[PDB]
């Protein structure tokens, strides 16, 4: 009937409100469009990617532009320890006079937002010092987005439309991406660090206006070709050195000091330069090297699911390594953005990993051809699918019964006035690893704690020079490089393990039963997402593979929550130098309820009250805002379609029978949300609320006490 949605004529003939909703949902699902050939499909993907890239470019141009225009970067560079980074100005007409005086902070004369994205500490390290270098980044990214947008349009034109064979030319892509995209980019990034980052950290300004004149090393590029590479490991920076000046500055550009710079409490710039140069070489060599693998190549969902899994794993990696090994100057000192950066990337990682299994299940129903897939690894995992699921079921139950059991045991025993009766297991396997890495606290005394061990001496070539810098930081109680752990850390790690196993279980069972089960032998014929199969055969709600992902989104949030809850509380004591609170209260759950949630919410909950308002009124409003939209999701998840469809019918009747309103009419007949729709809408509210509530609390609780 109507033209919208263009992608699906069957939705376009639906006379109800369902059409718009489903037309929004089935829009970027290019595969299910009308008449879409394989060749046309791929070219659309490619072009859509250019559009996404441009948005990314515009986004970080908008962060540069707003910081240069409304931030305090120039003021921050002068004293990173005491200057609060400004995100952008505040222009909300609804503000009153006292509220403008509360958000006119960080020494500003306008209301502004204190930034917590860590962009100030990232841009500083790269060599930016003034606002005009920031603005030059924003304009350049504007062009690159316009270069991205034009290219997407360009590669859609007849003469420039890539062939199908080009997109599936796998071997050429690995070589060029590992070589070019990864290798030469990493090599280029080494170029930026030795020619700009390292000079600016030593008080010498190097910009586009002079970089072709000045040299990164006193007599560089004659030792490089003649093989005397060791000259670049000349006199490093002294422990007295103050970042951003020439006092104590050296001249080395490639080193292997290890550890962190004593003032900024972060990695040495010269150390970061060598890393990227080495990494570059590895990728360039590997980039000259180029059944199951054909079914990888014909399914876009298989590739995406593996690419989500690969991104999801390394997204978690970024979070784990940035808090313990700080790579940006003065990022360890601002505790709130370090809290924000870990939480942000861990939640993203949870979505990616869950998404990886989601697109894997889509592959099994729509792309897996079981006749062309026999006697390989894929068709063997489906062959003992019930074994895998049952074992995943056992480990979850095993982990869960006992970790919760110990917590409940400890809680009761602590409630009855007898804390000495708690069951506290020392994390000895972990504490062994810390002693294997050099932490001399537990005294296990083998590998890099034993001073005569082969791993510290290395009598083959006398290599081991990373050891002095590393050992100083891992033994000094001033950072997060292998934090001290105890009984509290043991229990939570098994809770996190419980979360990783149960979340994987839901995703694995959903994928392996996607094509069919006993309750629904022909499930694959109905696609990835369908309501159910009616009340027959006992009942079939939540039987589709999509519903399995849906249930798993609840478990990942819970899992990433327990991860972020743990990281925050532990670091909270560590940042206040009173580690005793976490160590003793985390072994029972009332400690997590009284000394973590209730205790740290004192100021946040007082962002505004009957006596006034402070610079936390936003976070306090957001905190309540999050609770309301979290709870609003429960409505769609608990109450189902039927109640609402019948209720809506009385509203249709009422509208048509009331004068002065009867006169006007809907173009789309009102109907209740769909069965699948409600799950999605409920989960979206739940998960937006889950994150928005924790973000408001995390930021405000840490910013209040530091």
């Amino acid at each position: 009937g109507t033209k919208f949605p263009k992608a699906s004529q069957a939705l376009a003939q639906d006379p109800t409100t369902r059409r718009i909703w489903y037309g929004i949902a089935t829009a970027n699902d290019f595969e299910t469009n009308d008449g879409i050939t394989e060749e046309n499909l791929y070219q659309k993907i490619f072009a859509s990617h250019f559009g996404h890239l441009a948005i990314i470019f515009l986004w970080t141009s908008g962060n540069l532009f707003h910081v240069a225009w409304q931030g305090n970067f120039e003021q921050w560079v002068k004293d990173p320890l005491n200057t609060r980074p400004i995100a952008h100005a505040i222009s909300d007409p609804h503000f009153g006079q006292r509220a403008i005086e509360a958000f006119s902070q960080a020494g500003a004369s306008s209301p502004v937002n204190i930034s917590y994205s860590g962009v100030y500490q990232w841009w500083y390290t790269q060599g930016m010092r003034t606002n005009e270098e920031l603005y030059n980044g924003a304009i350049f990214l504007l062009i690159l987005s316009a270069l991205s947008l034009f290219a997407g349009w360009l590669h859609l034109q007849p003469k420039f439309r890539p062939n199908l064979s080009w997109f599936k030319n796998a071997e050429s892509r690995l070589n060029h991406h590992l070589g070019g995209l990864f290798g030469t980019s990493s090599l280029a990034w080494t170029g930026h660090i030795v020619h700009v980052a390292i000079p600016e950290s030593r008080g010498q300004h190097v910009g586009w206006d002079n970089f072709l004149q000045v040299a990164p090393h006193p007599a560089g590029l004659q030792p490089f070709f003649t093989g005397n590479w060791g000259v670049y490991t000349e006199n490093p920076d002294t422990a007295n050195h103050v970042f951003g000046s020439s006092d104590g500055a050296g001249t080395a550009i490639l080193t292997f000091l290890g550890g962190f710079h004593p003032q900024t409490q972060s990695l040495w710039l010269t150390d970061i330069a060598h890393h990227h140069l080495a990494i570059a070489v590895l990728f360039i060599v590997a980039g000259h090297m180029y059944g199951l693998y054909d079914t990888v190549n014909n399914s876009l969902h298989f590739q995406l699911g593996l690419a989500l899994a690969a991104l999801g794993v390394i997204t978690s990696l970024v979070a784990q390594h940035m808090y313990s090994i700080p790579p940006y100057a003065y990022l360890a000192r601002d505790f709130t953005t370090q809290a924000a950066l870990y939480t942000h990337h861990q939640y993203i990682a949870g979505f990616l990993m869950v998404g990886a299994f989601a697109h894997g299940a889509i592959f099994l129903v729509r792309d897996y051809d079981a006749e062309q897939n026999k006697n390989n690894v894929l068709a063997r995992i489906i062959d003992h699918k019930e074994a895998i699921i049952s074992h995943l079921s056992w480990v979850s139950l095993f982990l869960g019964f006992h970790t919760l059991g110990l917590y409940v045991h400890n809680d009761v025993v602590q409630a009855f006035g007898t804390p000495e009766k708690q069951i506290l297991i020392e994390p000895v396997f972990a504490q062994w690893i810390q002693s294997v890495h050099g932490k001399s606290l537990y005294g296990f005394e083998v590998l890099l704690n034993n001073a005569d061990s082969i791993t510290r001496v290395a009598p083959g070539s006398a290599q081991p020079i990373w050891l002095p810098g590393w050992l100083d930081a891992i033994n000094s109680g001033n950072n997060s490089l292998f934090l001290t752990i105890g009984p509290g850390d043991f229990l939570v790690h098994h809770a996190i393990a419980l979360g990783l196993h149960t979340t994987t279980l839901i995703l694995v069972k959903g994928a392996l039963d996607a094509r069919g089960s006993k309750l629904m032998p022909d499930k694959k014929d109905f696609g990835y997402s369908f309501p159910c199969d009616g009340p027959g055969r006992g009942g079939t709600c939540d039987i589709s593979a999509w519903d399995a992902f849906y249930l798993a989104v609840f478990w990942m949030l819970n899992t990433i929550g327990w991860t972020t809850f743990y990281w925050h509380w532990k670091h909270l004591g560590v940042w206040q130098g009173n580690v005793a609170q976490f160590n003793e209260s985390s072994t029972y759950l009332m400690g997590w309820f009284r000394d973590y949630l209730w205790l740290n919410s004192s100021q946040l909950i007082n962002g505004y009250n009957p006596f006034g308002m402070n610079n936390l009124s936003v976070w306090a409003w957001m905190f309540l805002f999050g609770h309301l939209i979290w709870a609003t999701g429960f409505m769609f998840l608990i109450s189902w379609r039927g109640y609402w469809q019948e209720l809506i019918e009385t509203l249709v009747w009422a509208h048509e029978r009331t004068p002065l309103a009867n006169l006007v009419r809907w173009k789309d007949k009102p109907v209740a949300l769909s069965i699948v729709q409600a799950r999605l809408v409920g989960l979206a509210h739940f998960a937006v609320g889950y994150i928005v509530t924790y973000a408001a609390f995390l930021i405000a609780s840490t910013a209040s006490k530091f």
Binding site: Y135, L142, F150, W153
Partner: peptide, 29 residues
């Protein structure tokens, strides 16, 4: 910053503003 550098940046941003409209109406067809 300066006041003229702001209007320079909004002048550049029409080029992604038109090329996004040129791409999105091409992705639609």
């Amino acid at each position: 910053l300066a006041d003229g550098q702001i209007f320079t940046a909004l002048a550049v941003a029409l080029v992604p503003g038109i090329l996004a409209l040129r791409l999105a109406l091409e992705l639609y067809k």
